[PDB]
Design a protein around this ligand. Structure first.
Ligand SMILES: COc1cc(Br)ccc1CO
Ligand SMILES: COc1cc(Br)ccc1CO
Ligand SMILES: COc1cc(Br)ccc1CO
Ligand SMILES: COc1cc(Br)ccc1CO
Lengths: 190, 190
C-alpha cells in the first residue's frame, strides 16, 4: 500500500465533500432550514480541517461558507457576526462590482440596525465607529430604529440580495462530482 | 426543484462520506497517526449528525467508529474509555466468537491495567468492581502492575488484536464508492 497515493485519494475525496457541503449549505440558507444549516456548517468546518493546502477555487468555497455562517448568525473576533461577514465579503466575489456594493452597503447598515433592534444602542454606536455619516449617527443617538433609511436598507432587503447571490453559487456548484453522482442514484430508482 | 429528491441525494452522499471516513479512521488507527485520527473522527461524527435513519450496515459502521474512538482514548458516561469500548464491543462483531472473546478479555484486563499504569489504584478497583477474580483483585490491591498476568494480557497485545480486526474492516470497505472513485482519479494522473 502506498501511503502517499492513499493520502492523495483522501485529499481528492475531501475536495469532493467540500463542494457537496457548500451546495448543501447554500440550499439550507436559501430555504431557511436553520437546523440543517447548523449541521451542514459543522460538517463542512470539520472537512475543511482535513485540508492543509487549498486551490484558488477551494479558498473561494470555504470563504463563501464562512460568509454565510456569519450572515446566519447576524442577529445572535471582538466584532459582531455581520461586521465579520463584511470582512469576508470584499476579499471574495469582488469581480461583479454592482451587486457586490449593494450587499456590502446593506451589511454595513444592518450591522448597526440589528444592534438597535436588540436594544443595544451603545453597541450600535461602537459598530458604527468601527465601520465608518453624521445623519446615521443622529439616527442611532435618537434610537430611531424605524427611520425610512432603515426601511430601504432593511434586513429583508439584505437577505434578498444575499439569497440571489447564493442562487448563483448554487447554480455554479449544482454539477459537482458528489452531488451529480448522488442525484443519479436517486433518479435510477425512481 | 424537488426538495424530497434533493434531500434523498444528500442522504446518499452522507452514506458515501460515512464509509469513506470509516476507512480513513481505520488506516489512521492502524498507522498510529493520532492527529489524523482526531480530525477524521471529528469529520465522521459531524457527518453522522446529518443522518437520521441508518441501515443495519450503517449502524455497524458508526459503532466501529465509536469503538475505535474509545480504544484510542484508552489511556486518557461515568465509566472509563476502555469500559465504554467494552460496551460497544459485544453489541458489534459477535458472529466471529473466537477473536471476539480475545479482544473482549484483553479490553477487560486493560481497563484495569491502564488505571494502575496511571497511578490511580482506587479507580482500578472501581473499574474491576464494575466489570467483574480474587487473584485479579489481589494484584490491584498490591499495585503489582508488572505481574506476569498483565504481560500476557498486555496493552500491546490488546492493540495487536484490535489492529488485526481493523484490517478486516479496512479490507471490507476498501472498495466503497467514494474511496474507489478517488483512487481512480489519483491513478489516472500518475
Ligand atoms: C433566512 O435567512 C437565514 C437563514 C438561516 Br438557515 C439562518 C438565519 C437566517 C437569517 O436570520
Ligand atoms: C473554514 O472555517 C470555517 C468554515 C465554516 Br463552514 C464556518 C466557519 C469557519 C470559521 O469560523
Ligand atoms: C496505536 O494505537 C493507537 C492509535 C491511535 Br491513532 C491513538 C492511540 C492509540 C493507542 O494509544
Ligand atoms: C456517532 O457517534 C460518534 C461517532 C464517532 Br466517529 C465518535 C464518537 C461518537 C459518539 O461519542
Amino acid at each position: 500500500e502506498d501511503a502517499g497515493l492513499v493520502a492523495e485519494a483522501e485529499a481528492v475525496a475531501a475536495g469532493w465533500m467540500l463542494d457537496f457541503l457548500c451546495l448543501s449549505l447554500c440550499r439550507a440558507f436559501r430555504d431557511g432550514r436553520s437546523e440543517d444549516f447548523r449541521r451542514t456548517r459543522n460538517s463542512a468546518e470539520a472537512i475543511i480541517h482535513g485540508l492543509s493546502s487549498l486551490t484558488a477555487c477551494q479558498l473561494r468555497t470555504i470563504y463563501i461558507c464562512q460568509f454565510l455562517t456569519r450572515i446566519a448568525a447576524g442577529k445572535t473576533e471582538r466584532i459582531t457576526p455581520l461586521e465579520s461577514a463584511l470582512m469576508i465579503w470584499g476579499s471574495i466575489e469582488k469581480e461583479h462590482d454592482k451587486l457586490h456594493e449593494e450587499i456590502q452597503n446593506l451589511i454595513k447598515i444592518q450591522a448597526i440596525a440589528v444592534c438597535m433592534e436588540n436594544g443595544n444602542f451603545k453597541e450600535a454606536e461602537e459598530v458604527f465607529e468601527r465601520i465608518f455619516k453624521s445623519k446615521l449617527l443622529m439616527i442611532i443617538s435618537q434610537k430611531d430604529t424605524f427611520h425610512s433609511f432603515f426601511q430601504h436598507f432593511s434586513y429583508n432587503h439584505m437577505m434578498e440580495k444575499i439569497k440571489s447571490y447564493v442562487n448563483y453559487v448554487l447554480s455554479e456548484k449544482s454539477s459537482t462530482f458528489l452531488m451529480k453522482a448522488a442525484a443519479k442514484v436517486v433518479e435510477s430508482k425512481r
